[PDB]
Ligand binder design. Structure first.
Ligand SMILES: CC[C@@H](C)[C@H](N)C(=O)NS(=O)(=O)NC[C@H]1O[C@@H](n2cnc3c(N)ncnc32)[C@H](O)[C@@H]1O
Ligand SMILES: CC[C@H](C)[C@H](N)C(=O)NS(=O)(=O)NC[C@H]1O[C@@H](n2cnc3c(N)ncnc32)[C@H](O)[C@@H]1O
Ligand SMILES: [Mg+2]
Ligand SMILES: [Zn+2]
Length: 860
RNA sequence: GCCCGGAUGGUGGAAUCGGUAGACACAAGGGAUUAAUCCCUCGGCGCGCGCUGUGCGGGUUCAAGUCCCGCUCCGGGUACCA
């Protein structure tokens, strides 16, 4: 051990230790209690960024802490390796997605290793491999065979030029990411998994997820968006088909003054026939972007159809308008409009002069003033014929019952949640195991034809998928006849919905899951990953868990006991536009940046004097080229410093705007820790500690050493406030370094303190602590060292600090025996001159005493 | 737009259940050492004190960064980025 802390030496040596001793390789060890600490596996995008480091350090932190408490700890790592970015990337570069992907893996594999995370590499999987997706393929056919998979047509961002399907991110203000040719809606038959058939289970079970944050439970709930309502069926004049709407407000039904139908809706088609203006509007309507966000900011636009539904209850003819915000894919693609009592229908009616008919009384039972807006709050019906006077509830049911009994209504449950569309029209993904025969008929790819390999050796024209470009590939034989397999590939969310299970038995060819290894490790105890995935990935995750329950593969209803969603690590992002429309993102490292007085970026320019559009902080991603790769910091300072720096920035759950400034503290703290163990162990062995014997100065110290341990443990295991944990530790160092060390007892305290510290540090900076255990002649490898237990008896306070306020204003602070009465505290408070200052001429009206902590003298 | 969050010194942040605002650091300035270590200073405004101060506006309480009502700005998601 040198005097100078030189992580460039220590870190690899410790890592190489871990590789060889296979420290974090774990088996289904039935003696030791298991803990399965899972961080959401990365997509291999090229380089680690800081966001991943927050994730995996939080992850390594809890894993190592947990091993330290004596548990058998699974911490796995792998590559969620299908996805878009490799497609674009592999052409820029003239490769196939596969070799670019595998090389991204090796590069990053290397980055995660040097950061010393304690992963069970024996368990690494790469989702692009047939060893892997063959199982999601077989599973899908099981689901198919079991009625949970279907085909409906679905709108897709089609580029009319390229004539190629684009993901929303490749749509830039309504244009194509390559050439500024305009994206259009195309409906395309696609595969769906009836996630909706598990809506109630997904919705109800959240109330059992005691250890999932509320943010995520609430987000998922609002997303599933279950409602009870009524579908209502209307006849239209001179049209042969009925129209159906879903409303949660049948109560407002006598206030229906129009219907609005989707551009795609046959009424709209039939009416277009003879109405050039409607025909225009529908044609316009494939400029409606396949994202909800636009579907909602876009201005509502609609053309009347000339058609007239019959209100089943009033008999009045009502206009059918075609509108741009009502979609066929989702529900009936026909809504019922009550302008008086829905803000969306208030706006619409205003704009196009439709009727704004009131039918619900203000809370006071008076007629609502509609002249500005809808009355949306529920209430007594009026001007609703036979239903007048009824409260919201009774009107709901009353209108429900009549429409039911007229056979045109029905009570129906609905969910905002739509089914999951897994068909992707792209190459780099697992092919969907479906098969169309000469028959014309469609079945699962036969068992014995799984997996359906995605070939890796391809020429990528960029525009088309190799497996759609080549006529031979689709060709198979099924049931004896020629058939064509599906050329669409899976939404890559599919691979990230079940990896957590495959990690328990990645090397198992007999099935999807060696359910004995799955049930040894499952459910995951803690699941760590971005807040970004609160909803989609997590909801697919639970879903899939449950489909795997429902296949007898796993025992528990839910996949993850605890969920830790870290905040997003963000960074300034910047683009210029290429000579034809191409958005070019420019790393913040390369941006030359002019700053405000509130410190905001005001101008930005790239190395070539390109003006840049600054976009603000957004999560770090290769998409905006704004990720900071830990690599340089790591090689200058070592993993431990980057790691502790990351955990110290702020608490896990809070989003964090990245800044390079602050590292060195973390680095200097580690030098202070090093120096102090160096110096303390240079004076050799210590006497056993004699507890009853120590100066009060030593007694205070030990009690801090012990309160820290308690705090850091409570911070790490209950709150996940690693930053406070660390600060609490730092302050102990500051104390420890101002403590005497010639005393036999000085040295013995120092030594207990320093073991407790070096262990407390370990989950954050295990390389330096591994080394520092050895010096302190710690028992064995620090990795399996037990977490330190605070001794209650070393933690009793004699006194306690009481804050003193007059009329709520702190005037004084006063140490006071823990066992102090209000009256002694009062009299004590009194002795303080600044308290006296404020009590002259005034009466104590009210005294408030928070025992042992605070005294307020309401004075008048 | 909707849903979820967030906002605190020059900076990141602490304050755990309504009780001390700024713990712990970074930056900066000054000093002791001829890059490294160490001191001191450090929310504002006028002092071994007074007032003020937790994005903005109201409000409840003895007491509000925290709770309630209305907002602003920022981030995440919004179903094909992952
Ligand atoms: C008071 C009744 C009105 C608010 C409205 N006609 C209505 O029926 N509201 S609803 O909750 O019952 N609707 C159920 C679903 O239908 C869609 N929807 C109904 N009306 C509109 C509208 N004007 N614009 C966009 N979407 C609309 C909603 O997305 C909701 O998902
Ligand atoms: C199962 C997880 C996903 C489906 C996917 N593999 C994925 O998110 N892959 S990743 O490379 O983008 N990220 C892996 C983990 O890192 C977190 N993360 C990614 N980017 C950031 C960021 N800017 N700030 C904070 N955290 C971030 C992800 O949420 C995921 O936990
Ligand atoms: Mg600030
Ligand atoms: Zn194009």
């Amino acid at each position: 051990m040198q005097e100078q802390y030189r992580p460039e030496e220590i870190e690899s040596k410790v890592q190489l230790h871990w590789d060889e001793k296979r420290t974090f390789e774990v088996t289904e060890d039935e003696s030791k209690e298991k803990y399965y600490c899972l961080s959401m596996l990365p997509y291999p995008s090229g380089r680690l960024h800081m966001g991943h480091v927050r994730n995996y350090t939080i992850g390594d932190v809890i894993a190592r802490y947990q091993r330290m408490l004596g548990k058998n700890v699974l911490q796995p790592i792998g590559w969620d390796a299908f996805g878009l970015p490799a497609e674009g990337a592999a052409v820029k570069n003239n490769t196939a997605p596969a070799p670019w992907t595998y090389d991204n893996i090796a590069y990053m594999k290397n980055q995660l290793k040097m950061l010393g995370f304690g992963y069970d590499w024996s368990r690494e999987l790469a989702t692009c491999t047939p060893e892997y997706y063959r199982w999601e393929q077989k599973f899908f056919t099981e689901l198919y065979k079991k009625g949970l998979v279907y085909k409906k047509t679905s709108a897709v961002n089609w580029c009319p030029n390229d004539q190629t399907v684009l993901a929303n991110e490749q749509v830039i203000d309504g244009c194509c990411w390559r050439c500024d040719t305009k994206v259009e809606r195309k409906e395309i038959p696609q595969w769906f998994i009836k996630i909706t058939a598990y809506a109630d289970e997904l919705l109800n079970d959240l109330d059992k997820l005691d250890h999932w944050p509320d943010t995520v439970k609430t987000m998922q709930r609002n997303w599933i968006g279950r409602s009870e309502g009524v579908e209502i069926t209307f006849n239209v004049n001179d049209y042969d088909n009925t129209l159906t709407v879903y409303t949660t407000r049948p109560d407002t039904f006598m206030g229906c003054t129009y219907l609005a139908v989707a551009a795609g809706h046959p009424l709209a088609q039939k009416a277009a026939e003879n109405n050039p203006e409607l025909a225009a509007f529908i044609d316009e309507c494939r400029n409606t972007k396949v994202a909800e966000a636009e579907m909602a900011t876009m201005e509502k636009k609609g053309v009347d159809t000339g058609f007239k539904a019959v209100h089943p209850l009033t008999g009045e003819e009502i206009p059918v308008w075609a509108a741009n915000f009502v979609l066929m894919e989702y529900g009936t693609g026909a809504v019922m409009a009550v302008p008086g009592h829905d803000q969306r229908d208030y706006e619409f009616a205003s704009k196009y002069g439709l009727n704004i008919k009131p039918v619900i009384l203000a809370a006071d039972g008076s007629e609502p003033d509609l002249s500005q807006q809808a009355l949306t709050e529920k209430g007594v019906l009026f001007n609703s014929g036979e239903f007048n006077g009824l409260d919201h509830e009774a009107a709901f049911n009353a209108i429900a019952d009549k429409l039911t009994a007229m056979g045109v209504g029905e009570r129906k449950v609905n969910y905002r949640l739509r089914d999951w569309g897994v068909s992707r029209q792209r190459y780099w993904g697992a092919p969907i195991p479906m098969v169309t025969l000469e028959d014309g008929t469609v079945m699962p790819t036969p068992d014995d034809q799984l997996p359906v390999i995605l070939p890796e050796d391809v020429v990528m024209d960029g525009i088309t998928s190799p497996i759609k470009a080549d006529p031979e590939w689709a060709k198979t034989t099924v049931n004896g006849m020629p058939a064509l397999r599906e050329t669409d590939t899976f939404d890559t969310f599919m691979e990230s919905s079940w990896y957590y299970a495959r990690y328990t038995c990645p090397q198992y060819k007999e099935g999807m899951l060696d359910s004995e290894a799955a049930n040894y490790w499952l459910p995951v105890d803690i699941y760590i990953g971005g807040i970004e995935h609160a909803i989609m990935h997590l909801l697919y995750f639970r879903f899939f868990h449950k489909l795997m329950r429902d296949a007898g593969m796993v025992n528990s209803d839910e996949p993850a006991k605890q969920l830790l969603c870290q905040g997003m690590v963000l960074a300034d992002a910047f683009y210029y536009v290429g000579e034809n429309g191409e958005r070019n993102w420019v790393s913040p490292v390369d941006a030359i940046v002019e700053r405000d007085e509130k410190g905001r970026i005001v101008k930005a320019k790239d190395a070539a004097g390109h003006e840049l559009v600054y976009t603000g902080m957004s999560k770090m991603s290769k998409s905006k080229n704004n990720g900071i790769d830990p690599q340089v910091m790591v090689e200058r300072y070592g993993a431990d410093t980057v790691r502790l720096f990351m955990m110290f920035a702020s608490p896990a759950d809070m989003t964090l705007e990245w800044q390079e400034s602050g590292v060195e503290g973390a680095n200097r703290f580690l030098k202070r820790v090093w120096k102090l163990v160096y110096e303390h162990t240079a004076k050799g062995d210590v006497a056993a500690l004699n507890v009853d014997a120590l100066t009060e100065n030593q007694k205070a110290l030990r009690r801090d050493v012990h309160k820290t341990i308690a705090k850091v443990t409570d911070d790490i295991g209950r709150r996940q406030t690693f930053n406070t944990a660390i600060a609490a530790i730092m302050e102990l160092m500051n104390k420890l370094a101002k403590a005497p060390t010639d005393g036999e007892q000085d040295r013995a305290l120092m030594q207990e303190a320093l073991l407790a510290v070096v262990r407390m540090l370990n989950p954050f900076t295990p390389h330096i602590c591994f080394t520092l255990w050895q010096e302190l002649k710690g028992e064995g490898d620090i990795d399996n060292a037990p977490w330190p237990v605070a001794d209650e008896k070393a933690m009793v306070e004699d006194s306690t600090l009481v804050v003193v306020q007059v009329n709520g204003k702190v005037r004084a602070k006063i140490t006071v025996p823990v066992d102090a009465t209000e009256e002694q505290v009062r009299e004590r408070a009194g002795q303080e001159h600044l308290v006296a200052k404020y009590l002259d001429g005034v009466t104590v009206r009210k005294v408030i005493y928070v025992p042992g902590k605070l005294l307020n003298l309401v004075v008048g």
